[PDB]
């Protein structure tokens with residue numbers, strides 16, 4: 001069973017002996033720090049952490065004893081705020097005396113703005129604000145996945161609109177194949193749910209359950225998939241029988257869309273000879289609601305995609321759309337699911353555009369690039385103390401390392417506001433109290449062990465829409 | 472509650488309909504495919520997966536119904552193999568009819584060798600082998616952390632041995648600060664445990680419990696930490712009171728080691744004037760068992776370490792060790808916990824060596840670089856079918872993409888062997904049965920719902936030792 005007393009950076013266990021004596025309040029904030037591109041970030045994932053880990057009776061006698069026993073061996077010393085944890089158990093029935101205020105989930109906010117703040121609601125628990133830094137900072141992950149996923153959506157929308165004249169199917173153009181490429185089951189669910197803020201396609205089922213339990217959607221599920229082969233279901237037929245495997249699978253799945261990996265031995269032979277000749281009669285007969293989707297999975301991603309389209313365009317009837325771009329027949333599409341990240345995604349669609357291929361023709365799958373090849377440094381996700389009260393006097397605190405101005409932190413009590421031009425500004429030093437900038441956009445979401453404001457996944461999706469979708 | 476019917480890639484739900492008719496056996500294997508350079512990998516972490524997710528009754532009526540309802544909406548179609556899962560429920564009381572063979576955990580094996588194999592033990596459950604690919608493939612993560620952690624130990628060992636003449640304290644030279652920098656609580660525990668294969672220092676508490684539950688150590692805990700400041704415990708005193716903060720903290724922790732972040736405003740001032748002058752009397756009085764450990768945390772990592780050392784060298788009595796390298800007094804050390812990954816670690820220790828500073832003087836902390844900035848591509852961790860039986864005939868299967876020879880997979884039944892020179896070789900096409908290469912080095916670790924062979928964390932550590940330690 002999860003124990004919040006064991007869910008912090010070890011050294012934090014020792015911090016109740018380090019703050020200035022007579023400190024009644026520690027107030028800290030989280031930002032995606034500006035770095036001297038990722039100019040705006042989707043705020044998502046806090047509500048999961050609040051419900052799964054922080055809410056309700058999270059302290060018990062047994063949990064305190066367990067922690068005491070572990071830390072004694074871990075430190076080879078007795079340092080551990082047993083009294084402090086007892087106080088929360090006795091006075092608040094194990095509920096964290098903490099208030100967290102946050103921007104609504106789904107909101108898209110420029111770098112360098114306060115996204116949430118944390119403070120203790122009882123003077124005795126001044127040490128608790130930063131105890132829970134470790135667990136709260138892990139919000140960097142769904143924030144970064146949602147943000148990086150949204151940025152790939154911008155690229156797709158731009159090129160889809162240019163080559164086709166509309167955005168139809170945009171929400172299916174980047175599929176999550178990341179289940180096997182992430183570091184754990186829990187990461188898989190969190191990461192999949194963050195991708196679903198922006199798209200509807202995922203093969204990692206864990207994302208669905210998480211969304212239902214922690215956020216909720218009107219639709220039965222937030223995510224979808226279609227029948228698809230892997231290399232094992234082709235190669236199991238034997239090297240001389242790829243055609244047989246192909247024929248079997250497309251016939252099994254004759255009325256739904258079907259993805260078939262085509263590069264087991266020779267992707268170009270498979271497209272030109274097998275699909276394009278031997279089995280062409282099983283492809284051209286297919287419904288528009290059930291195309292064959294050809295899946296290359298090796299080689300230079302751009303070069304392979306172009307050569308695959310070139311091959312197919314000579315074997316199947318291609319049309320030219322109203323924008324001047326070439327379009328495969330509706331029963332035939334391509335998915336590139338190898339080597340895809342935000343950099344290569346851009347290179348592929350631009351390369352397709354150069355060769356006059358509509359983005360209508362293709363969709364993308366991303367695994368490690370989508371859910372694993374990301375770090376806290378990408379958006380400089382960071383949690384810092386900005387305000388303390390000591391001897392009843394509030395003081396604005398901050399770091400400002402001489403060798404790195406980029407690591408300077410904000411001062412005092414913070415608030416987030418709309419500017420007169422409609423942008424965002426973070427006010428420091430309690431200047432929000434002057435009320436010159438309209439309402440603070442941060443809302444209380446957690447207070448004294450209870451979740452006080454929640455968002456549905458439908459609202460979050462609405463908040464995270466692209467401008468191009470809006471327009 | 473975790474449901475293994477829902478812990479696969481969505482598309483694998485439809486695979487029982489895609490294999491050749493009358494297939495009775497699917498046999499697959501995992502390798503770190505040969506292409507840095509990461510020539511050898513530590514095999515670690517399968518035992519966690521076996522126990523937490525695969526063993527015992529993993530199928531119930533409720534889990535079957537649950538997955539049915541989920542997949543119906545997910546595919547917008549009824550495609551779930553309800554009958555197959557019911558067969559396992561009814562026949563084997565929900566225990567998986569699967570056999571897994573694996574190299575011992577902690578083993579250091581060159582790239583391109585079979586590390587584990589998977590096959591169904593019941594003909595009806597031919598589809599089961601690749602259903603669990605997704606869960607088993609996540610072993611890439613502990614393998615890669617452990618391997619990358621060990622590669623850094625190799626670097627530290629070389630430079631420590633060169634500058635000091637021994638390896639004393641090596642196991643504490645790379646400390647895990649990755650708890651906040653990983654993608655989840657579960658990942659934190661797994662990765663920390665993998666780091667602990669090589670080192671004893673971690674602030675990621677979750678690692679200890681994982682090891683205790685799934686592996687076990689003779690000692691009460693496998694990892695240790697020491698009291699340390701963060702920016703909030705320095706800055707909370709106010710910008711004009713950094714000295715007061717330093718004095719309070721080193722006085723509170725006067726007889727244990729204490730790490731004190733010193734770059735809140737001006738690292739160089741902090742070292743030269745605050746520590747080196749104002750509070751010097753509180754530092755030179757400390758025990759060898761309780762040093763002050765000064766922690767810079769910003770600026771170019773190499774330049775910052777070198778300047779911090781030059782500053783301290785002029786304020787405190789420096790000795791020259793037997794190898795001719797400079798050594799701070801035993802009550803004073805440094806930890807660099809910013810910008811550290813396998814690349815910069817190398818640059819820092821080489822830079823220290825060039826300036827005649829012993830590696831004894833320093834330790835490193837790494838977070839995202841240690842536990843998060845790694846992918847399945849680093850070691851090319853990959854799971855592939857190599858052998859099937861269809862119509863009673865065994866077939867050696869494989870992929871071999873024309874535009875990428877690096878993606879070619881192995882053929883047939885596999886086994887791992889010791890060569891005449893004492894190295895590892897993987898034999899394909901069932902050739903291990905010819906008995907020209909001695910016994911198979913893989914062991915059966917899982918069979919029909921039971922873990923059949925396991926390793927303590929102490930055994931794993933021993934297996935993973937560096938040659939220089941041996």
Ligand SMILES: CC(=O)Nc1ccc(NC(=O)C2CC2)cc1
Nearest residue numbers: 172175226228229259335363482
């Ligand atoms: C629009 C589209 O192409 N969707 C789509 C295509 C393929 C897959 N799935 C696969 O290709 C799996 C085998 C990897 C999922 C959605």
Ligand SMILES: CC(=O)Nc1ccc(NC(=O)C2CC2)cc1
Nearest residue numbers: 011643646699700730764806834
């Ligand atoms: C040998 C050594 O220097 N160990 C060591 C030093 C510092 C810390 N911990 C910290 O510096 C925490 C503040 C980040 C842990 C172990």
